[PDB]
Design a protein around this ligand. Structure first.
Ligand SMILES: *C(=O)[C@H](Cc1ccccc1)NC(=O)[C@H](CCSC)NC=O
Length: 271
RNA sequence: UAGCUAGUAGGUGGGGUAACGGCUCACCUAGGCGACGAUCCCUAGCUGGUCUGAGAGGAUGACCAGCCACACUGGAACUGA
RNA sequence: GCUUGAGUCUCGUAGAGGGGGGUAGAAUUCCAGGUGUAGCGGUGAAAUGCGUAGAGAUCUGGAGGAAUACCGGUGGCGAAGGCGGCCCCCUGGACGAAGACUGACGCUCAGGUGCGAAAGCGUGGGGAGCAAACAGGAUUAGAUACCCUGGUAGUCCACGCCGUAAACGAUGUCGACUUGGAGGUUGUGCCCUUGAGGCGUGGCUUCCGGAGCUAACGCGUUAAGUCGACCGCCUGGGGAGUACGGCCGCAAGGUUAAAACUCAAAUGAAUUGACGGGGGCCCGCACAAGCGGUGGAGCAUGUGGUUUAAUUCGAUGCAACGCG
RNA sequence: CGCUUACCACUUUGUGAUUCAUGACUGGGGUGAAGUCGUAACAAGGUAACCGUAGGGGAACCUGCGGUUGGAUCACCUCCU
RNA sequence: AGGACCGAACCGACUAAUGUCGAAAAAUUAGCGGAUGACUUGUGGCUGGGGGUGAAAGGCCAAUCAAACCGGGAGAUAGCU
RNA sequence: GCUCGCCGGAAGACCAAGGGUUCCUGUCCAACGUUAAUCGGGGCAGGGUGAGUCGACCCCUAAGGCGAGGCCGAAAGGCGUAGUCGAUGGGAAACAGGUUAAUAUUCCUGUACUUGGUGUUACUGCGAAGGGGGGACGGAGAAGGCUAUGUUGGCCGGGCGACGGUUGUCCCGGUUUAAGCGUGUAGGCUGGUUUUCCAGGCAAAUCCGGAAAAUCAAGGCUGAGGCGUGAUGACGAGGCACUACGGUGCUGAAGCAACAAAUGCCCUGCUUCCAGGAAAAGCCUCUAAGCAUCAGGUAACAUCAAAUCGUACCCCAAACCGACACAGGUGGUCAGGUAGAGAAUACCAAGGCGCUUGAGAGAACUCGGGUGAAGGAACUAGGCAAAAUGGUGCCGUAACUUCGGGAGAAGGCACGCUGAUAUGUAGGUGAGGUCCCUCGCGGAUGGAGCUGAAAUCAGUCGAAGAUACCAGCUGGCUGCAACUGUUUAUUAAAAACACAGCACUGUGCAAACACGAAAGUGGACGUAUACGGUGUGACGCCUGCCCGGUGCCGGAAGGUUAAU
RNA sequence: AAUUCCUUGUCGGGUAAGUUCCGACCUGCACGAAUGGCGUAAUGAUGGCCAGGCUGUCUCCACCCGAGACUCAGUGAAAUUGAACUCGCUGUGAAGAUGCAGUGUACCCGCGGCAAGACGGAAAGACCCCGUGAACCUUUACUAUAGCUUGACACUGAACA
RNA sequence: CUUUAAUGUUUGAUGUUCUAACGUUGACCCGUAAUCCGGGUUGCGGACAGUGUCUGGUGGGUAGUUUGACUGGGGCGGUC
RNA sequence: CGCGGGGUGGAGCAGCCUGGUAGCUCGUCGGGCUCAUAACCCGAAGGUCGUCGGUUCAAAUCCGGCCCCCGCAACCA
RNA sequence: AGGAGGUAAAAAUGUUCA
RNA sequence: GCCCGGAUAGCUCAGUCGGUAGAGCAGGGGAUUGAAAAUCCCCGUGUCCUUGGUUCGAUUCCGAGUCCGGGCACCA
């Protein structure tokens, strides 16, 4: 629902609201609610390790089941929700044994669906099962690298991964960035792309709109003095230096990929 | 040039004119005109006739004559049939 | 009142007519695994690019998006644009048959409304191949062209907008009449189906031509023939389908639509010629197959150029230059 | 008669519309015996043309998409009774 | 609905005068801007000296900041007064 | 003591904070107060702070801190698990009146409530650092129902009046009443009830959750205010009475109704949008390891206990922070009358003050203001400053445009008072009566009373009817920046910064990057529609040529090439 | 032009008069397309210009009401200063004389005012220079170093091609 | 000597496989009601990764410093 | 400083590992080429092959030593 | 008779009138 | 003013062993064609700013007067 506003006031004219009429309007489910402390971007020492973080709206963390290890138990999707600290909608599922859980909402979804996690479920949106049972070529999400880690990749709006090939006990995935990383074949994956994919079409419109998301203003480099930023200085607007980070490392073209304990898993790299 | 008008469309009563009438006031009705062209803008005295043209028309309206209008510009009124 | 107008009902037929949803096969591109080795790819030739990290080629499997081989036909349908692998649902139009019914409800139509190829545009997805812009190699007097290796938007789908084409049989629509032949296409009637059939009756459509018309070319029962009904539009060319304004459009612009000026032609058909890196037949020491020369050396002779008091004048593509 | 009320022309104030000249300067166009670059169209104009549309380029023009004919030409050579 | 409008509280600090051994080591008076938000404010915590924080002025970090304050090197050094 | 003037959404009356006896009385006047001083926040002595219900302590928890073991680091020390602290948060219980020189929801009178210990009686299964429910919550907006409170009338009491009138539609004062208990309303929330079963809730579970049948239609919960009661009580204007003449004692009528109405309460509601809105304990309930003639629990009753600290005074200021008895700053609550949209403003009430140097004079000059003939920016760096416009309703309103605006454009008309329309209309509220009923705080009908716009007409006064305080200057051209916003605290508020938006680039999770010798954290309990860095800075049309230099990405065969 | 040295360039409008303003001409000292270019409705305690209204801003000030200034009583400072019996003038002079020379002039002492001087007071000039002073800042200045990165050895082994 | 073919041999490396070192911010159990940690099963990587010592390169991110004198003031030019 | 590499008509660049050939193109003269211009296609000028010495039948080449350039590690009077 | 595979690179320019 | 670049035919401009001066167009003629164009040839096109010296010879190599442009002309 790409609802574009009308220019009634300055700053309002560019606000495009993505509304979801099927989302539950009521309060969240208390049993799965746990507080989520805002950090401001400070660590143990208290220093600001990451800039541009602060303020924003208070929000509560809704524990999400990523593991999907309730082996062989049908469950119906009670309702669709809104999760602040995430780009994707979350669904409240109810199992046959009478237990409620939060799973990420896939694309082909609707309140009244029935899913089930395990190595027997049908190749259909929402079902979870190991990757060595799925047809090679199927599109999944919420996959992992460790057999039971919980689910790492493809965890945002409209995000999916395509199981490209099966080599031995490893599965090649064409990632969102355009990678091709082999992951352990026994890692779980939830079929179907993640819904709420119109998160991209949204435009905040105001400077304050970002301020309640928690994005404090980013000060440009060439606006400071020489002591603050390796760009700084200048009489009146002149750069004359090579674009670097606040800490000398040259940005715009410096592949800092350095782990080497994982280059054995990357078949094809981002291009 | 696509809508225009508000004493403006009509009725009633008084008044007014040599005479009828919104000609003019008061009240009531909300109508009246309009694509077979209203309002607006530009232009222009009209006609008998004149010139031309085989005819039909086209252009035109000076000299003679009929009529309307004007008399430095605009407004009002009297005298008097 | 009636009926030869027109409209409606009953049964069926043909059809890429239209919308929505699944599905299928071949091929292309990409990716993974096995096999396997120096080329692959391309052109007028070459190169860029791809490759010994192991391509291309080959086999297996998967992934997607787009377009539907043969059927296929100057075949069919639709108002036109335009529409074709298969299947279901929803639905529009036309046509034939033996009858009936209503009884002119008809036709046309400024304004107005809708649809309206492609390209393009906004919002959102998708994105194989192909491919504006762009990059590189060539070609080249120059190549911001044609050729070739890649390539963003786009081309496709949903909802709006745009409203324009050589949107063209350059032919408005409706109705009537006006010699025929040769095919295709779709109903239908009768006779012996006595065999790939024979003879009539309607719709659509292709080709050729008679009358007649037309400037000619040609149209020619789907007419540009003979008539009637109503509408749009045209009044020399360029200016210009341009300006100003209005109206519509997010934008690109569209639409309605001049004047001054300048020229006195512009234009169409057709014919005699010429020409064409158009075609066909034919011919030549033209080529082809050869022999000997030329151009390289010295020299004779003529011309141009230079020079000179004059170095007479002419001739000066082939067709001047041992010529006068 | 004077005073006074309604009516009322010249005129003033503010805010629109329309139109005539003028206006530095500028875009495009018409026009002009022998200037510059290239050669786009006319034959198959040497990449067929043209129309519609977008982008591109010192200039005509170029490329992509769709459409039309107001495009020419169909002979020579390998297979089969 | 609104980083919407006018406008008190509240917050801020554009103009002018006053004040400048002041009432005050940046205030007063008369006018100003924001005033449902990127708003303001109370209480309690957290980040620290070549470090913190900074809608970025080299501004702020206890009336002190192009590197705070306190103590110690240390009676630094001074070709200068 | 009598007049006078000022504040009155404060200059009033109270808490937190923070001070620390400044509070009250007697007395003293050197020093302190910018003057005098029998005066005082000054000196001296004495007096004063009374709590089961207020707050803190207490129980629990946030940000965050410390941190047994543990990990890491030359040492110091850093981080952090179990735990243990930490309110500005959550959790039991009281109100009215009187009294002091000074204290009081703290003492006294009266009337109540809450949480535990122990004991008695009758029943019944109780029982965790464990589970579930609850606690438990966002912004904005509108309405309805009420109350604080105010006004008016009736009623009671006093007056009838030093200059004209005033026994009457007259004047002044009063007309006060809480917590608790009972009813359970306006309104809101949720469909109740029984049975069987179950891969769920680290174990178990009758509790919560889930799946099918059955039964009836409502039950249950929450809930301001009102009405009774509290209360034939207190209070209460005014008198009766003694004065150290400051005040004490005694007594004490009326004490209702109507209307208006909050930012207070219902509201920890309802509608809606999105940026999606603490935690734990108290409390309720079910069981595990267990304990069952027990122990405990439920209900009623009796008795006992409710400890310790603060409590005085100031709290928009001479008592706090500013060196001062300083024109500055300081969070929260209540906040009346008339006019008014209003917590603006003006004048007043309650209440509190006249700011701790005054008396004369009436020069220049200065500061703060008023008015000004004629002209109206000629002043001047510049219309700086003053002046002016200033409100509500109606009419009317351009270029341009992102079609919202521009715009309150501009510019005009009417505004008071009286009467009439109408012995105050429309409207709002609304008693009695009548009827019915699943009978209560009910619903229709009904209309007295009360309150009360605005519009039109007529009349009238003045120079002026938005008459005061209050309260836009408008228009045109154009540069720059989109806008709200932020900044040099204390000479620069801007075109600077930010900004949503656009783009390139880095990053595949043990992520990049950052703090940190390290561990570990932040990034993020996020994972490419995500995060970091950089540049530009809405929106519209676009963004051209160049790879030598430098940086970067990639291919490395050859040359050079460290340690070894 | 927030950019044009020459320059107040040239032309047109505006004014009686216009180094500014506004629209253009290109001679761009030395604009230029994300250190973004050119437009742009609205917004602006923003920059420049114009007109109306309006006034003491001004022509040229006049008057008046209050708080000071003044007088009396009480309390009672401050910056500063070598010592003073502390005049003008011309000249001299470490080069601008209250103090020297010459000369004129001038009874001693207060109060209210005004500011030309006492190179008046305040701040051991911040301008300029010096110091083989300091401090931060920059970089393809020198020498180092955190970090990132390369190779050898150790933690670190077994096998066949 | 230039150029080359098989083999033996001396070393640098590469390919692949394995599990025992090691890593493990994978799952499970226990210490324990505790996402730290430690240990034990087990899975996945695997002699890599990562760390130490020596060493080359880059390195204004950070630190310590130099950056002449004469001079009709100083800078510039010139000079020594 | 010592392992590398490179010097060619007036400029630009092959012949360098293999000794015998001084060329391929831009620019200038000419010849054609066409009817003519231009364009392509050709044959010559013009290089002490950096200088000196020297193995061989014969030198740009393989060889020597030294002047002149540009890239590295270097260099503590 | 009936239908398919194969089929040439470069060539710009020529002033006014008759 | 000084550091620097030039004055050349009618006009605009070439030119560094130190060697008696050249280009195009303008003007005229000729070839030119039918008349023109286009193109070539011919000719006049001269104190080489002015003023000096050495020299076989001076525009040239250097000094000084004139004329025309770009820059030292920096801070306080
Ligand atoms: C030169 O301009 C210096 C710089 C300066 C300005 C202001 C204060 C201090 C220094 N001007 C002065 O030194 C002035 C004199 C100006 S005369 C040209 N001195 C002030 O005290």
């Amino acid at each position: 629902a790409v609802v574009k506003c009308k220019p009634t006031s300055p700053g309002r004219r560019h606000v495009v609201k993505v509304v979801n009429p099927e989302l539950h309007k009521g309060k969240p489910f208390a049993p799965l609610l746990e507080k989520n402390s805002k950090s401001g971007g400070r660590n143990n020492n208290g220093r600001i390790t990451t800039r541009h973080i602060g303020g924003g709206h208070k929000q509560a963390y809704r524990i999400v089941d990523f593991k999907r290890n309730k082996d062989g138990i049908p469950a119906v999707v009670e309702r669709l929700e809104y999760d602040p600290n995430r780009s994707a909608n979350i669904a409240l599922v109810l199992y046959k044994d009478g237990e409620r859980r939060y799973i990420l909402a896939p694309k082909g979804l609707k309140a009244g669906d029935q899913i089930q996690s395990g190595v027997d479920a049908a190749i259909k949106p929402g079902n979870t099962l190991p990757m060595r049972n799925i047809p090679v070529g199927s599109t999944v999400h919420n996959v992992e690298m460790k057999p039971g880690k919980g689910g790492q990749l493809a965890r945002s709006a409209g995000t999916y991964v395509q199981i490209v090939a099966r080599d031995g006990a490893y599965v090649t995935l064409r990632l969102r960035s355009g990678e091709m990383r082999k992951v352990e074949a026994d890692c779980r994956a939830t079929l179907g792309e993640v819904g709420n994919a119109e998160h991209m079409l949204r435009v905040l419109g105001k400077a304050g709109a970002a301020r309640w998301r928690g994005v404090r203003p980013t000060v440009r480099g060439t606006a400071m003095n020489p002591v603050d930023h390796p760009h700084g200085g200048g009489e009146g607007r002149n750069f004359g230096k090579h674009p670097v980070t606040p800490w000398g490392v040259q940005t715009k073209g410096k592949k800092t990929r350095s782990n080497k304990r994982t280059d054995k898993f990357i078949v094809r790299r981002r291009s």
